[PDB]
Design a protein around this nucleic acid. Sequence first.
RNA 1: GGCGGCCGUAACUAUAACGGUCCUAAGGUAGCGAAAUUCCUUGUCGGGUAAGUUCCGACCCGCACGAAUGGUGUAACGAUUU
RNA 2: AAGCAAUUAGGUAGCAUAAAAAUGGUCCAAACGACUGUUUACCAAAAACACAGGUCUCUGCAAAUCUGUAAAGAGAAGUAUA
RNA 3: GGAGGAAGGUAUUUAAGGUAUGUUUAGUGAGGGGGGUGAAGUCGUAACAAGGUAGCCGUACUGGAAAGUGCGGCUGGAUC
RNA 4: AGCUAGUUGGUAGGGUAAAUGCCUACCAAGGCAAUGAUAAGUAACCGGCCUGAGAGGGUGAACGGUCACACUGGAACUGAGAUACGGUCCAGACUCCUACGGGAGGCAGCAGCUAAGAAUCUUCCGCAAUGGGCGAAAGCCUGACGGAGCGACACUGCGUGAAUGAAGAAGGUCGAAAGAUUGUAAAAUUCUUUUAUAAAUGAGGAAUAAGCUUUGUAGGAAAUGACAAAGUGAUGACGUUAAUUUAUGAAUAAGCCCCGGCUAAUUACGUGCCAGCAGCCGCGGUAAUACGUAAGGGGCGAGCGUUGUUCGGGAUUAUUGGGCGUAAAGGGUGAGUAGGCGGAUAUAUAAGUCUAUGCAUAAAAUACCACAGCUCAACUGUGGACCUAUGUUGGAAACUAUAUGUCUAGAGUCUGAUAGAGGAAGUUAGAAUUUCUGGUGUAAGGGUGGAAUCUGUUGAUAUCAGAAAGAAUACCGGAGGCGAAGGCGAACUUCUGGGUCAAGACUGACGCUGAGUCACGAAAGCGUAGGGAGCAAACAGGAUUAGAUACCCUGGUAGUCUACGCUGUAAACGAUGCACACUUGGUGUUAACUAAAAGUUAGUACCGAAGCUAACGUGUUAAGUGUGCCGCCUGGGGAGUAUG
Lengths: 124, 132
Amino acid sequence: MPTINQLIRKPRKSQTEKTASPALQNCPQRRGICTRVMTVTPKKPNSALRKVARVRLSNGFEVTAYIPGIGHNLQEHSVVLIRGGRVKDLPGVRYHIVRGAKDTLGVNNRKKGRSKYGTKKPKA
Amino acid sequence: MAITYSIGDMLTKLRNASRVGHGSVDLKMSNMNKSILNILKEEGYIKDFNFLEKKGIAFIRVLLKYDNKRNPVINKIDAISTPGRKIYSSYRNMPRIKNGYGILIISSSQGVITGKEAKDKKIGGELICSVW
RNA sequence: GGCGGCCGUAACUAUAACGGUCCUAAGGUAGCGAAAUUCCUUGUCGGGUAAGUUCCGACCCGCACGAAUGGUGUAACGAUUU
RNA sequence: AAGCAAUUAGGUAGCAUAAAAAUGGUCCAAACGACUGUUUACCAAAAACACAGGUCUCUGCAAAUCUGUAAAGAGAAGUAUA
RNA sequence: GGAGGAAGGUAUUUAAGGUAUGUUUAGUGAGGGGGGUGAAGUCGUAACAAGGUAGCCGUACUGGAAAGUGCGGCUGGAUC
RNA sequence: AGCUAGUUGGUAGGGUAAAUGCCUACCAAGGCAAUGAUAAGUAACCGGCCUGAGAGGGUGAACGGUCACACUGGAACUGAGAUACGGUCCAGACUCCUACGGGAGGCAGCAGCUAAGAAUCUUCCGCAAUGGGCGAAAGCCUGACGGAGCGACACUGCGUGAAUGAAGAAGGUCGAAAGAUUGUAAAAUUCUUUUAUAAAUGAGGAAUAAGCUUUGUAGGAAAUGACAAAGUGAUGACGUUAAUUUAUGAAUAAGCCCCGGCUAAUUACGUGCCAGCAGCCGCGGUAAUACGUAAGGGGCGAGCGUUGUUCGGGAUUAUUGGGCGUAAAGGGUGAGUAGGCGGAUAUAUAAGUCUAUGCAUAAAAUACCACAGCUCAACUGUGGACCUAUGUUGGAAACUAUAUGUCUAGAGUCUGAUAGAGGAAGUUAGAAUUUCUGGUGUAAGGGUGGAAUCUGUUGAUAUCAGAAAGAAUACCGGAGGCGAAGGCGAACUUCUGGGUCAAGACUGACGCUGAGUCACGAAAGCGUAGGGAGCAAACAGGAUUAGAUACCCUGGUAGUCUACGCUGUAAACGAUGCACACUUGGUGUUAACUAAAAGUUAGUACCGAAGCUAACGUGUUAAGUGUGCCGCCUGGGGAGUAUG
């Protein structure tokens, strides 16, 4: 405890939490154009080759977004819808591509948790 | 000198003497100290207190009270109001110390009175201390 | 007054922090650098111009800068030069 | 007309009212030299010389130094803060 | 003839525009500087044991590099 | 970190419904500011909303109140009211029409279009009700408002059936192929019709207006008329209204996420550090409850998940309710301004506080508690309050505050005694070392783990005598002493600061802490001028080593020293700010009081009970129990960096 006089002279300040996803500009999700697509090797001691895309957003930012699900068809110039979410493996990847978005479609032959990958219901 | 408590000095001295288990403790003398010790005496926390002399200065000698097993009657005695933090309360918002097992002592328009007396006389004031 | 050469060397390519060797009294530190010094040369890149062998800002491969024959800067000053 | 004056207000006249003459062009950046000065009378006024400042070294007084074969004079009618 | 009425003229204030100087802030810029991840590459072995010169703090100088040394200070220093 | 020059105030005047630099002309230079002026950035405000036990935190959708704006920037007119959204004038950009002279336009009104965006509606009906404008009235206008349509966007409710129904159908899955599980689930039988369709019935929002009939009142000579009252009197967009009654029949109707721990829910195949999962920890390398697909299980349900943002969990900005010896955190130290806080006691004031939860004001809605109306709920309505916010009335006075006194125990002055490397200035001393000079004397000296460089036949080292200079003060000397800290040790004097004890009198709270500010502040370093023995960065040589820009050796320039002026940094440490009131002891030690013991007081060390501490440890010199004030901390790196 500082003395009440001390608190009166130099009032307490609470430190302000900071956004994990600054490029969204407090919008739930944004749209951009895939300026490049590639695979990247994660940190240690993981193994795989994760597929990411360098995207120029509608507001002028560059970001790098992960492409979830098995297989995809993102070429260059493809418009996409990114949302928040950080991939721990990848340094600098801080957004996710939404499946079932404008130029991205669901992962083929998905039967559990379809809505997380934008795939229509396989008719029974 | 910055005594800062004619109240907290006696409270601290009484607390220290009580936990080490002395028989009597010997405090400075003032109207408020007399009033507080009087309230203690009615509430059965201390046995008695006497007025004395040393070098021409008046003292109050208080007789600590313990059970037969040398467990003190006073368990915890602690201040609420404080020169840097003055705490006043209405007669409705008065806290009941420890579900009434303890007592609250306040300074009010009608003198230094216990919390129950303050409630029964519908008066409030500064919260001096809490004893249980 | 003086203040060096040669050769090899890294998860492309490049260079060489490093290592070896010969020689000397010792082999140029700080800083600066196509400079009032740079031959090759209008070197290379950037700025200025519609177009700039001059000029300004850098790069360093300094033919042949360099510390009181002072080195690098500097407010103010100049019938100086650009 | 106000106001001590400088100026202020109104009115009048012209294309122009510091009406003639005399009376700074300014700004940005670089090189060199700090600066005021001095210099090739008669093609070079400058980046050259001088400069305050700095260091090294000489000189104990019939001092070092300089001019003369010398005496002698300057240094100095000074004395290492010279 | 007031009505100076109403146009017209003149004058003050003023938006826009123009000129000049400072000032706040956002991009870009040859080149330069350090920082992080990827390198597990090259050079050396500074610290952790008395780390093989005890360690560290302030300051100064010097060296490819970790660093070395001078001065003062500390134990948060084995051993005896 | 300075700002303002109509800026500050005054005297007149201009103007306004009206005060005022609101404006103008003169007269002064004033006004504001580390108690935050000015400036930059951000933002309409409030009733409220979200969250939370509360305090608070975040926030300003809808609805209601106020303010500002209506393309950008100005200006006035009309008018009770405007510096006027669909009025006027001017300038600017843009769009459009021209007969080229010039004109027309402002959806941030209701719908709608383009662009932008992750992202949001019909170019609908009606003035029947409510409200407003005009009119005597009829009546007209009203994209306000009443309704409808659209969107699972939120909130609330209902249905997609219900009751019997096997040791238990087929299949699926797990298995040893006994059997389990899906599972009374289905099938089958029976029952019901909210919903679906059709028909019938059908409240309420509605009041009447004009007009007409009648009564009464004011008025008057009197009707017409006005007012009060009664009766009559057209009128529903919604609307196929809400609700109700029959007719047909299980008929018209479920998905989504998850199943390693956090976190309720496991097995079987395929993949083999590939493919992929992930909020955190982390899974996958040949037997994956974590990947992918099936079978089961859990959660919620016309929704379910993900992302974005806020609060909560976070006591992780701690007033309620956290810390600073070693985890991030005590300033190097002191003196003090503003400020905060403060002994005993008397009186007065009543700012704070408390009370009559007086009395009012805190519009309505919302928020809380009951009672009601929509079939219930949401929703809606009528009452009743709980806080706490301001103003005011009358009281209480202890405490804080205000004003005037009193006291001495706190703190000071005076007196006496006394310890001390406290500081500054001016003098003096010896040992030792180095150099120089003069004797004796000869071949080594010096140095290391071992050597060499170096020194020496120009006479070394060693030894004797003399001279000179510089720096530092053995023994005393330590479980000391003093000072705020840094620090202070040969001897003396002068000048000078502080502490401790006491009946030993005086003042009478004169105090504590202290943001800025000021002073001091080891060593290193810098400027000027001296000095320079020894030691010694840089530097040189000799060695060790692969190399040695080092450790070791021989030399050696700054520096170390003095005077003056700067720098103001340390592991400046007790890693522990200062002050006061208290809380068992043991063993030493310093000073004083006492002749001395013996004890006390003020220090200074070790151990240690209780207590405290995450532990180490601390423990009357607290890191124990309390408070006053100041400084400082809020994950690590980036970083004590970049910039100012």
